[PDB]
Amino acid sequence: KLGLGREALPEEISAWDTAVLPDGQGLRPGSGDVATGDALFADNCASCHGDFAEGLDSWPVLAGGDGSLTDPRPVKTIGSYWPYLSTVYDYVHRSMPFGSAQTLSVDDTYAITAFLLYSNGLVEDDFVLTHENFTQVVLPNAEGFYPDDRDQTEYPLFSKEPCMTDCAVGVEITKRAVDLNVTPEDPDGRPAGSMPDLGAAAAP
Amino acid sequence: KLGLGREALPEEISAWDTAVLPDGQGLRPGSGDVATGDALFADNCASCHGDFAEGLDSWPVLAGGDGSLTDPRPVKTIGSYWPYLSTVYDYVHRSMPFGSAQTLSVDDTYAITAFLLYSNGLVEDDFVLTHENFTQVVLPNAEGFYPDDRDQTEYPLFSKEPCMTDCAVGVEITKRAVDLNVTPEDPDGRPAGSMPDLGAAAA
Amino acid sequence: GTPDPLITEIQPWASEFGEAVDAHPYGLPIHFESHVKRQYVEWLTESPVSSINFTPIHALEGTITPQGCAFERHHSGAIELSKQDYRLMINGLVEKPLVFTFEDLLRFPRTTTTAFCECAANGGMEWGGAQLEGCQYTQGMIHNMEYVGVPLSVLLAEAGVKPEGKWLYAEGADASSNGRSFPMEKVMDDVMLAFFANGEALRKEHGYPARLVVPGWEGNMWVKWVRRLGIYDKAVESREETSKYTDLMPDGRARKWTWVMDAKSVITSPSPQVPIRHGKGPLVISGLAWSGNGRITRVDVSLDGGKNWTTARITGQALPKALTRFHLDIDWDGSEMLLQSRAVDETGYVQPTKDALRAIRGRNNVYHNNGIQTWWVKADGEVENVEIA
Amino acid sequence: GTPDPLITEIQPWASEFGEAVDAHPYGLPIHFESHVKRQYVEWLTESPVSSINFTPIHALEGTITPQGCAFERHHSGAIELSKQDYRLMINGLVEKPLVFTFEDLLRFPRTTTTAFCECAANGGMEWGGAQLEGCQYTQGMIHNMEYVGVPLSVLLAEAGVKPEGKWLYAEGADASSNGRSFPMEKVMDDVMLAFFANGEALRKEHGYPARLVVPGWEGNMWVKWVRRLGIYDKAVESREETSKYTDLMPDGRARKWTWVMDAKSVITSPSPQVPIRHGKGPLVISGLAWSGNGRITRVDVSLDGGKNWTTARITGQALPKALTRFHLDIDWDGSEMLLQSRAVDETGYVQPTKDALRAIRGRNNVYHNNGIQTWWVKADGEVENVEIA
Ligand code: HEC
Ligand code: HEC
Ligand SMILES: Nc1nc2c(c(=O)[nH]1)N[C@H]1C(S)=C(S)[C@@H](COP(=O)(O)O)O[C@H]1N2
Ligand SMILES: Nc1nc2c(c(=O)[nH]1)N[C@H]1C(S)=C(S)[C@@H](COP(=O)(O)O)O[C@H]1N2
């Protein structure tokens, strides 16, 4: 060891390490109910995420989309998609509200998490979330993920000897970005940042 | 060949290729005398280089310093140091006056060059420099230069195995830059651009 | 012929002075290069502080990205964090939890790497078709810099990783935190806490004064403004590795922990922002190739939509997990072309077509689109983003 | 034991937003890094348009110089030359003299090199003693960039060099011209007409839109804003290779055509602008080494004025004719030190002492000072430029 740094104090660790792991490591003592969460959500969150956590305008939807994961356009929310409740608590506590993060107490965060469960149809309106019962909650998509398997499912296929000559591929144009016309433009209508025409006069 | 570019026209080559080599390749027809050069110098050059090409303030000295090349502080000028007259003509024509270059005609440049020769004591005050006699002029330091010989005189010496341990070197401090105190400074007196003290408040 | 007055007439720059050496202590590009800048596509996101901009890769050459136009991706904006206010904590399953100042960090043994930072979402808007016009937009969530910093192994050695410690969780000083979990094997390999990028301190927007550099791994893991390294016995499964940076598959399950960025390439010119205006004859095809799985070994280029391929040349080195420049010089006869490039890396992996990827993953992966890009070069020299089939 | 409020209290940057992704299309360093800039020493020259400024090499790391703080040397100032107005002429002993537009030049096959540009005069003020305080000043007339452009050999092939054409003369578009003569063997080896440096177009002050890159050779030959390549049967012996960039020797004769820059190094920290403020214990010694004669093979560091040497490590690659970063980590006990670095290149050349150089050349060489630099580190951590004997 080089002898650099100094020992972190308990107060310092407590202030910065608020991560919660899926098995409940990192949970702190506290509780909150759905009704309290609703009130907190109204005051601090509904302005973006809706009174029922359903989203306003284009802000994130926090409830809904159950069973949509094989639809043409899935709706991925806490209830339809997230695997663990730990993530809800942790992310809310650390990073919301957007623009004024880290203003929620431990109890406030339990209450809000209870309300998000209720809004996703996962608990009744009298539910109380505590540090003791937190890990009893299992989200619908808990078993919906698996570690990267490209090494089994893609790399062998894509590491085959590729074709160089007279390759049997289709070359008919099927999609064109210009059909959408949703790229920023320069004043002349070209894609923004297009190279200047060196045959025309240089810009002032 | 890729077939890129197009043929340069004679007018174009003439406009941009004004280089003069030591053998007179690149000289154009013309002439100028010392007296004409003095007048041109007065109007276009002397404000920096002096009425006699001796320099004003800290601007370059164009005449003087003959025989000084083994002095503690040599004075290197056209006369004391430059090897070829070609360079004088070419550089003046292409690059002076400073801030308004390429304003001299061919004849103007011959005249100024004649005047610089005169100012260096190398011709008399009635000398006429022309394209035909230009290469007769030999400057004092024409033989003062030799091609890089580090491969003979340094590389063999400096490519020997160096000392690593218990080397017989002198380590007494002999010179200190702080004695001069001529480096730009930050407001606290440190050399300008010194690293901020991370133990002090951020700017 | 008629002599060109730009040669036959003396121009002011060949007579008068240019600017003095004291004019610009820290300079910017000449004004004629104003198009070589970051671009922002408003519709892609809900807020400009949790959003993305795009490196002007259409206009660049070589491999080093100028840091002033190197893309940004933030989740709560680019924060101002002085070296005086900076703190790095190491805690969790360590023998002694530690706090470092920036001063302390400048005293550890240093290392270097040159590495691409590619956002996992680069090209993601192209998963379902051809949407944006220009490689700045469809491939420009990338930058490539020379980093200098300290290996995480040496910092962790100072704290003393306990035998139970299996994962490192890194989080930033910003409101968003961007917490991500790393297996210890990667941490101890080549993850760096970088302080310098392309010679100088990190730019504010790139994590000043310290960020993680995670060679070959998705950009989200390159935690900026890094404040804490926690050692745990399991992955945290944070928002940025559950809700986000997970890759939905056709059966409704999703891959997680898709850390590596696979071999990829793009032709930067011709491209939609770089039309051919000079007519028939010699034409430079230029582009970039890279792989998170090692060194690029070759890049093949097609002029006919993948029916036939010619091996390009690599210009410069092919460093591991770094941008690599390729060139193919052709003689353009003015015919329409369908340009493609296809990277190969040292593992033998060959960059797949978009169709080959979708045949496995479907259309809702969001991330990790390394599919072959096609440019349609028209007879007028204009260039389009297309799909072909 | 007193918690630090920078950790225990939530700071604004961990709650509120930072700047948006649309705030800065082309960014600059954070304001805390304002000391990392070019510096100007007025007394060195009579005019600020024929003058020099200095790269902040004390503060940099790695090898790539940020182009915004990369030094400038001009003789008639930094000119503005658009790509529209640019013309390159090849004439003289060629089969067909040519004029190229910039559009034309973008159509030739491209190459790359990474190379240091060191002014011949770098350290020249130190020939006669210790004068300036800081490696920015005594070694900072240097920069190192990744260049892309076209080899001169391919341009010259278009014109067709005649067998009598033994020398190439290159001149700039500026008033000063900076004309220099090159032997054809060097031209045909690795001289490039560069258009890109560190990814983007050359900066105005670095020759936009085109300069020569002359690997390993004195910076004066790196003609900026290059307008003409003339092929002659002999050297022109222009002002910049007769009056200037000739090296006066003890007998009153002078070396001419001292093209190559010899192996050199400098410790960038500690250095006079980078004092040791952190007390005793771990200390990073960092520096740069380079050679015009090829790759650096090692750098030795002394703490005791050359009585004893320890081989440092190369951090990154040692590319030919390019800056190379070295490090040596020590445990500083607070004693005074006399720091030196000594480069060795692949030819076996070992960087000489100042005294070894002066024994051969005397004191009036002006150029090519590659002598070993000594730093006196004092007990208070302050650092001085000294000579020792
Ligand atoms: C009041 C305390 C809350 C709570 C409980 C939540 N939000 Fe927000 N939120 C906003 C934006 C722009 C995002 C996206 C951020 C990004 O992508 O980087 C979010 C995200 C969330 C989530 C995650 C959703 C997901 O599916 O990943 C959650 C659980 C969440 N928020 C909870 C925007 C806003 C606001 C607009 C100004 C406000 C107010 C809030 N959020 C408040 C809250
Ligand atoms: C009027 C036409 C003249 C002529 C004949 C000369 N000058 Fe100047 N000069 C000036 C400066 C700053 C320099 C140095 C430039 C640099 O080092 O890049 C020069 C240089 C010269 C030389 C070369 C001297 C040498 O020994 O190398 C010569 C031959 C020369 N000049 C001739 C400054 C000025 C001016 C200041 C505004 C003016 C006016 C002139 N020069 C004008 C002329
Ligand atoms: N602290 C923090 N680190 C972060 C982010 C963030 O929002 N906060 N964004 C990440 C993402 S998604 C990407 S792609 C990269 C982008 O790095 P850049 O901004 O240097 O391009 O930073 C990553 N690191
Ligand atoms: N046209 C032209 N090129 C030039 C110069 C000049 O004044 N004009 N100065 C030269 C000198 S002396 C040096 S050291 C280098 C400096 O390159 P830089 O300005 O990119 O550092 O440019 C060289 N090329």
Ligand SMILES: [Ca+2]
């Ligand atoms: Ca306490």
Ligand SMILES: [Ca+2]
């Ligand atoms: Ca209210």
Ligand SMILES: [Ca+2]
């Ligand atoms: Ca509160």
Ligand SMILES: [Ca+2]
């Ligand atoms: Ca359009």
Ligand SMILES: [Ca+2]
């Ligand atoms: Ca007058």
Ligand SMILES: [Ca+2]
């Ligand atoms: Ca001082």
Ligand SMILES: [Co+2]
């Ligand atoms: Co992934």
Ligand SMILES: [Co+2]
């Ligand atoms: Co020389």
